[PDB]
Enzyme design. Structure first.
Site, PDB file in Angstrom:
ATOM      1  N   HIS A 138       0.813  -1.225   0.000  1.00 45.13           N
ATOM      2  CA  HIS A 138       0.000   0.000   0.000  1.00 45.13           C
ATOM      3  C   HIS A 138       0.847   1.277   0.000  1.00 45.13           C
ATOM      4  O   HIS A 138       0.277   2.370  -0.031  1.00 45.13           O
ATOM      5  CB  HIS A 138      -1.038   0.007   1.147  1.00 45.13           C
ATOM      6  CG  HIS A 138      -0.489   0.191   2.541  1.00 45.13           C
ATOM      7  ND1 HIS A 138       0.035   1.383   2.992  1.00 45.13           N
ATOM      8  CD2 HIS A 138      -0.497  -0.640   3.614  1.00 45.13           C
ATOM      9  CE1 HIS A 138       0.372   1.264   4.268  1.00 45.13           C
ATOM     10  NE2 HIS A 138       0.053   0.047   4.670  1.00 45.13           N
ATOM     11  N   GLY A 141       2.390   5.927   9.884  1.00 44.73           N
ATOM     12  CA  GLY A 141       3.754   5.879   9.390  1.00 44.73           C
ATOM     13  C   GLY A 141       4.567   4.687   9.867  1.00 44.73           C
ATOM     14  O   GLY A 141       5.681   4.469   9.365  1.00 44.73           O
ATOM     15  N   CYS A 168       3.803   1.593   9.326  1.00 48.49           N
ATOM     16  CA  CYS A 168       3.663   0.512   8.346  1.00 48.49           C
ATOM     17  C   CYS A 168       5.022   0.118   7.840  1.00 48.49           C
ATOM     18  O   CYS A 168       5.824   0.925   7.641  1.00 48.49           O
ATOM     19  CB  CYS A 168       2.727   0.908   7.223  1.00 48.49           C
ATOM     20  SG  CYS A 168       1.012   0.944   7.766  1.00 48.49           S
TER      21      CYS A 168
HETATM   22  C1  LIG Z   1       0.107   2.210   8.582  1.00 48.95           C
HETATM   23  O1  LIG Z   1       0.826   1.940   9.552  1.00 48.95           O
HETATM   24  C2  LIG Z   1       0.470   3.426   7.653  1.00 48.95           C
HETATM   25  N1  LIG Z   1       1.467   4.279   8.007  1.00 48.95           N
HETATM   26  C3  LIG Z   1       1.814   5.337   7.241  1.00 48.95           C
HETATM   27  C4  LIG Z   1       1.150   5.593   6.042  1.00 48.95           C
HETATM   28 BR1  LIG Z   1       1.647   7.081   4.980  1.00 48.95          BR
HETATM   29  C5  LIG Z   1       0.079   4.714   5.617  1.00 48.95           C
HETATM   30  C6  LIG Z   1      -0.240   3.628   6.453  1.00 48.95           C
HETATM   31  O2  LIG Z   1      -1.228   2.781   6.103  1.00 48.95           O
HETATM   32  C7  LIG Z   1      -2.493   3.358   6.099  1.00 48.95           C
HETATM   33  C8  LIG Z   1      -3.593   2.177   5.935  1.00 48.95           C
HETATM   34  C9  LIG Z   1      -3.217   0.935   5.414  1.00 48.95           C
HETATM   35  C10 LIG Z   1      -4.197  -0.106   5.274  1.00 48.95           C
HETATM   36 BR2  LIG Z   1      -3.674  -1.867   4.538  1.00 48.95          BR
HETATM   37  C11 LIG Z   1      -5.574   0.137   5.672  1.00 48.95           C
HETATM   38  C12 LIG Z   1      -5.936   1.364   6.185  1.00 48.95           C
HETATM   39  C13 LIG Z   1      -4.942   2.411   6.324  1.00 48.95           C
HETATM   40 CL1  LIG Z   1      -5.396   3.965   6.971  1.00 48.95          CL
END
Ligand SMILES: *C(=O)c1ncc(Br)cc1OCc1cc(Br)ccc1Cl
Ligand SMILES: *C(=O)c1ncc(Br)cc1OCc1cc(Br)ccc1Cl
Lengths: 298, 285
Positions: free
Chosen positions: A41, A143, A145
């Site tokens: 993602h 962030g 992720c």
């Molecule tokens: C998740 O930890 C994360 N961190 C930073 C950024 Br820029 C995006 C992110 O994921 C957002 C996310 C991923 C998924 Br698979 C489902 C919902 C959301 Cl909000």
């Protein structure tokens, strides 16, 4: 003396954490040899995350669209491919700090340490269990992720963070989610969660080892009737076998500790504590308890 | 979101841990620049030490220092308070930027628990008001260090002794925290109170993460009864008050009445205000 939720030392993982940017989206990636692993993602825009078509979004991407920084240094990306829900960026330099590593899929109830990371920089380290329902109760901000979970001179990567549902969900390093989850911003049901019985038992053993014996007073098939009633995972002979060493080291038979726990479940704790907790703890495996009680090192 | 007892990343400390052997006594030491630091009781046998007399019977070659496979050469030894300083002929090429710091009671740090110069694990501790720590320390953990990170590692704690119960040690200048001495005798730690300003910081963490139920206005009178450190602590808690729109002490109802907060059935006091903010906003290192 003492007993603490203890994470693995994080140094070997820290040297693998890089930053991955694609569009406005930035998250953490894992750099081993000449491959950088991160959640697919990273390619989704704000509008994409509600229902991303990952095949079609990736098609619109070229290697140079992926900016990967390992500190002040920028790696050049020479190939990109998607494996389930993880993106694999080939880069032209192999990570000099690559540890001996394996990729592992853990079983529910198993524990690991998480190196929470932002912008490719470590923020902290903590020990987690994979809940029976394949979620994890962590500490993950926007962030985080791409932060990974692991066990340890060889690092077994078992988890990459993908999403906050207040609980957290993600994949192994082959990109296969733990649990029913998909990588889209939708509501998604996690199962009914349960307590990891074999772990509570292991933690009661640690308690006895450290002097907390006040709770010490059945049959496997009978205890399971109680466990089922209190939303505890059923106990198998496999669990009893894994509790073997602790039963020998402490000299309390596993079905005896089970009677102790049944009493705790049927009666509560009366405001007492066990190892400084007023709840039964289930995020220590029988391995963890042994590891810690005997000081094994890496 | 979520809220966990989070330890600092340990890599920069791992590269600093060494094994120090003197006689048949082995424990952990900390190799920074051309100096290895360890508890002076490394020089003690099993049979009330007179450390100056014991050290006098010791020469540079009686100290064996190993860093992984590499063995360092000691070329000098002083005793500063309760630490041995072994000057070695080699600066640690992995020395991180670092300071030695003496922390105050109620402050927190990470312990890199070690045996034979090797990392076992890492966890977050608070310096209890009575200057003990409730850690996880087996015979052999002596010399393990506590630390905070800011690229700069501030070493604040070296492990010296498991009491009957808890743990005690020194700063990196060898000054014990608390009334303890490096001798195998019964040693009393005074009554230990709860770190009030930490429990408050944790309640803010709880509100930030959506645990609302405990919100229900000198009246310290209650804190004294429940053995809580007296509540300057308001000024430190300021930014959390500004973030949540809540100084909350009316915790009073919690103390008198006693469900879970942030997954704990106990009030927690090993998060400082700084810890909550670091974690709830993603401070990195
Ligand atoms: C998740 O930890 C994360 N961190 C930073 C950024 Br820029 C995006 C992110 O994921 C957002 C996310 C991923 C998924 Br698979 C489902 C919902 C959301 Cl909000
Ligand atoms: C303490 O952690 C420790 N580990 C290993 C070894 Br070989 C010795 C050791 O200290 C033992 C000790 C130190 C003190 Br200051 C007081 C009592 C005791 Cl048992």
């Amino acid at each position: 003396s003492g007993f603490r939720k203890m994470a693995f030392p994080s140094g070997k993982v820290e040297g693998c954490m890089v930053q991955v940017t694609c569009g406005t989206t930035t998250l953490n990636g894992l750099w081993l040899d000449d491959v950088v692993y991160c959640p697919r993602h990273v390619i989704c825009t704000s509008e994409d995350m509600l229902n991303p078509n990952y095949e079609d979004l990736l098609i619109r991407k070229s290697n140079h669209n992926f900016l990967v920084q390992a500190g002040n240094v920028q790696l050049r990306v020479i190939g990109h491919s998607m494996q389930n829900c993880v993106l694999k960026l080939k880069v032209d330099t192999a990570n000099p700090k690559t540890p001996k590593y394996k990729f592992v899929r853990i079983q529910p109830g198993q524990t690991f340490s998480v190196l929470a990371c932002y912008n490719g920089s470590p923020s902290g380290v903590y020990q987690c269990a994979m809940r029976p329902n394949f979620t994890i109760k962590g500490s993950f901000l926007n962030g985080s992720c791409g932060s990974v979970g692991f066990n340890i001179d060889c690092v077994s990567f078992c988890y990459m963070h993908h999403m906050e549902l207040g609980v957290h969900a993600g994949t192994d390093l082959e990109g296969n989610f733990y649990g029913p989850f998909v990588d889209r911003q939708t509501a998604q049901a996690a199962g009914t969660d349960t307590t990891i019985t074999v772990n509570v038992l292991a933690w009661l053993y640690a308690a006895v080892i450290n002097g907390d014996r006040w709770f010490l007073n059945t049959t496997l098939n009978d205890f399971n009737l109680v466990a089922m009633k209190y939303n505890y995972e059923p106990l198998t002979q496999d669990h009893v076998d894994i509790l073997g060493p602790l039963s020998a080291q402490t000299g309390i038979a596993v079905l005896d500790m089970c009677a102790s726990l049944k009493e705790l479940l049927q009666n509560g704790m009366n405001g007492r504590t066990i190892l400084g907790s007023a709840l039964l703890e289930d995020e220590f495996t029988p391995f963890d308890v042994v590891r810690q009680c005997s000081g094994v090192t890496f």
